[PDB]
Design a protein around this ligand. Structure first.
Ligand SMILES: O=P(O)(O)O[C@H]1[C@H](OP(=O)(O)O)[C@H](OP(=O)(O)O)[C@H](OP(=O)(O)O)[C@@H](OP(=O)(O)O)[C@H]1OP(=O)(O)O
Ligand SMILES: O=P(O)(O)O[C@H]1[C@H](OP(=O)(O)O)[C@H](OP(=O)(O)O)[C@H](OP(=O)(O)O)[C@@H](OP(=O)(O)O)[C@H]1OP(=O)(O)O
Lengths: 210, 13, 210, 13, 210, 13, 210, 210, 210, 13, 13, 13
């Protein structure tokens, strides 16, 4: 990644064994749950496109999701190429070239070209654009990998309200309320909630129904 | 496309 | 987070894999016990609003508590907006803007705006205000997540006094004495404690009843 | 409100 | 904690995940055995009163011991207030105030006031005074938490002398000899030990009785 | 007293 | 490896226990799956030929794959010797010699010669050439170690489409589509997919067949 | 411990959680086997007498061995006092005092006095003298804690020679040859070894008897 | 070990808990397999003779192998003494003495003498010579500790060729081909291999026999 | 003696 | 060849 | 010999 040294300059350091280790472990244990996206966003902080590529290639499962990510990255690279064309000819000697849509992904661009783009004034944050594309991929997979719809989440008769709210909101996060939450509740709890009315925080509902 | 099925991340066609 | 480098300046460093790892592990193993709040307060030391957001999003369970935290943060951001209005117009070039209530939460403000607010003289501790709001949320959840009331804690006939005091005070911490502790005790132990009278430390009671 | 149900932390309406 | 940077100055750094992790793990696995006190003394080396407070709040069990510690800290803070009164009025601008007994505990004093007291010439070691009070608490709990008295430790007929000495001295450490050790021994081993007489090291006894 | 039963370490009355 | 110190110079540091540890653990747990290649590429970042040799020798299993790697490295070293001959005679005193094909592998070249080649302007990236040869070996082994052909991957009647796509693409990665993926699918799913037609992303197929 | 900072000066740093952790773990798992002494010698490298004291107090078992260590340290401190008397009177202001035998153990001397003795020219290595005394203790315990004598180690009829040599030499290390090793061997192996004669390395014996 | 600080000088740092930890763990889990030698060579990078001694003494098993190493080190130290005699008399004050064969092993030489030899221009790499002797020992033990001869490795009728090649080459590495590999194979696989003929890479054989 | 039975390391009589 | 069967990585013939 | 049986590494006769 690109870090700030003790002297006071931004230098490229080599990825630690733990960014890779924790990344493989979170994708292995948590699959593609929503909270897995922030991990990637936090583990890859300051990472180069090459580093992001290492993280993506380290995973050994869910290859269909990886192809989703591939297609998303190609669509975004085509949109970058369309929005920001770049000239060809000869790269000027001792000079920094423009980043293509394929360059941001790290397919053509090399690591020295990458750190040239990052250590610039003003810097071209190719890592941040690549992170944006990878994240768009990840949100897309996570949204379409949800096990059940929000309509399916309904509270059981013997189930506590807390568990129902937890299930409801984990499903709501997976697919990215107020009125819907009461509709799925059983006649118990709903008896008091309908009497509560509008303007009550989630905690008022869960306290009255505790 | 920048990426195609069957090759690792960061490799051209 | 915002740390002090060896040279002697405050710089932003990227969150470590362990702050995230330990945070997910403590919320997974200890749920929302009171001691979980200090962990967050200690793990997120010097953290930016973005870092606090990563920590909050890393958790994958107890989503109703997360919505409690959301509502608390919105109430506090509305109170910040009400107490400290900020002008609009155009942000002056090369200048630092005022922090909105939404800015402290990190919804509109970007990381560069954040570290501009922290590395200032005098600094605007947006991270500390956000930590205050998140902590208010956490205390609220922990208080309303307590399994039983302090009135329920009563000492058993065959149970040692130590266990009763431990249960009593863990419940007292969960919901944030002197006379009440003796009332819940069985006739044994109370026989000696009533004879002890006022002015005795907790240890005098537990020593006489040992 | 700064935060609404259904989106991650740090995202506007 | 307050550490020495590579440049050569004492700066506050943020507590590591391991001080907290190891602290919770030692209190969880070893409860309040005597060796747990040095761990706290070694883990909290250079720690601020706020850091000491985080360590104390991280524990989730043995709340009665925590209240013992609370009462001990209040007694010591009252004694500090009595021994070292401090004036009121207005705190002089850009100046460092005197530390109250409550300040050393970190209840009123903030972290900036704390590091002002530590980075001073001569420095006011509020962390060391707080550590003294916390340690007095810990010794008090450990002494009064001992399972059995030293009189109870007696050597069995088939038990080796080594095990008896180990039990005897772990109990002696828990509650903070020469003649007593021989009295609790069985007629075997004592047969030779009484013949040995005064002036023999522990190893002479354990070698002759091996 | 500096500390009372029922509140975390480092908080006044 | 060759890293950048805080002062701002490239110096050789000694390999960490974790590069070795994580390397042995990934080769032990994941055998020669494709994602194992990026690990090597990420763990050995900045590593010298000697360091690469340590990593290769640390593995204790799959010795036939190691001999594949040996033969690949000899072929590449012979091609380097053929492409870039080097003179003999006497090495000039206080001077840096040309890297042979055997030198890049670290068989004749010593570590001081290596760091002389890396800390040069322009530098001779012997580590990168050696990494290229080792990686060519690794891709060769991984491609020829695949358990089954892509023709074998077929979707079962009761198997979800997601699992079939995952198997198909893990096999495709192991041996380094569009039309083939539909052919192996059962009559179910294919019923809708044939109706979809060309121009549909992978996600359109997996959504319609969900 | 006393380490060398990056700038180039010897400064006291605070003991890491791992020196304590690894120390408790090695004493817990390996008890007092001979190899446990080097661990202490390697883990406590550069450590102050206070740090050595923390390490010693961290152990929670084998208290009789701890009292052996105590007595050894008192004998060595008395010998230091006898060999190197020190004057009393008043400690000169802003001056460094002479180290007593009790000072080296850290009973009277404080940490500032300790680092004054270590950061001196010429330095008084109180840590090294204390390490010498602690190590003398450790060797004494390990020698007298050996389960069986070297005379007891004898090779079984069906036991391989390798196992017999391993047992023989682990016992020899525990209590701190050539002719004795052959005497304890069975008639098999001895048949060939007696024919070998003097002047054969251990490996010649184990190869002929393999 | 002897490392390079951030300022740009070679200084002695104290061995980490992990070099010891990983060393004991690899010798415990992998015994004396060939890959254990590189671990020692990689873990002890930059280590002093004293550090090498700590690593060797940390192991608690395989003491006969340790005595093999002892004898090897004595033979090499005698050869060093014979090749490089050193004068006696008086060591010149403030001067660096010549390294004896016993000095390289660390038996007489102290750590200050060691780091004087390493931080020299030109430096006397006593650590590297000691590493050479220890490694010669290790290769000797590993070669003579092999369970079976290469002649014993033969392919079974139902065993895949891959497993046979793996066994063959792990045995070949343990004791430090082309024609021999085919001879041990069963009539199956050999049927095709004899038809292949000379000039085929290992992979050609394993592909045709797959 | 510098150390006596019954107290931690580093404490006087 | 730079490497032959039977010896560790980085050793000549 | 520099090392003899029965003593740790780094100790003279
Ligand atoms: O203690 P944990 O929370 O369970 O985490 C540890 C630990 O992390 P550290 O390297 O920072 O210490 C390990 O070292 P230990 O201190 O536990 O010894 C490590 O290696 P070990 O095999 O020696 O434990 C390992 O084990 P593993 O990765 O196989 O699980 C690992 O556990 P985690 O994977 O949970 O992080
Ligand atoms: O090098 P990594 O595998 O990336 O992890 C290291 C490391 O492990 P090794 O020394 O075994 O290589 C440290 O070693 P120890 O200090 O534990 O002995 C360590 O220590 P902490 O757990 O106390 O943090 C810490 O970094 P550092 O050395 O600066 O303390 C850490 O990185 P992570 O904990 O994030 O994995």
């Amino acid at each position: 990644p690109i870090v700030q040294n003790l002297q006071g300059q931004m230098v490229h350091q080599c990825i630690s064994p733990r960014t890779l280790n924790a990344w493989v472990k979170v994708v292995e244990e948590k699959a593609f749950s929503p909270e897995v996206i922030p991990m990637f966003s936090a583990l890859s902080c300051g990472a180069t496109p090459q580093d992001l590529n290492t993280m993506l290639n380290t995973v050994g499962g869910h290859q269909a999701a990886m192809q989703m990510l591939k297609e998303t990255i190609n669509e975004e690279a085509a949109e970058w190429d369309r929005l920001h064309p770049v000239h060809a000819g000869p790269i000027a000697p001792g000079q920094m070239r423009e980043p293509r849509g394929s360059d941001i992904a790290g397919t053509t661009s090399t690591l020295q070209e990458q750190i040239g783009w990052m250590t610039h004034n003003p810097p071209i944050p190719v890592g941040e654009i690549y992170k944006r594309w990878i994240i768009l991929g990840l949100n897309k997979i996570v949204r379409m990998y949800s096990p059940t719809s929000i309509l399916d989440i309904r509270q059981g008769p013997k189930e506590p309200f807390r568990d129902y709210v937890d299930r409801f909101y984990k499903t709501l996060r997976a697919e990215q309320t107020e009125t819907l939450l009461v509709q799925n509740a059983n006649p118990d709890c709903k008896t008091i909630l309908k009497a509560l009315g509008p303007g009550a925080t989630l905690e008022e509902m869960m306290t009255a129904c505790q | 496309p920048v990426l195609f099925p069957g090759q690792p991340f960061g490799q051209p066609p």
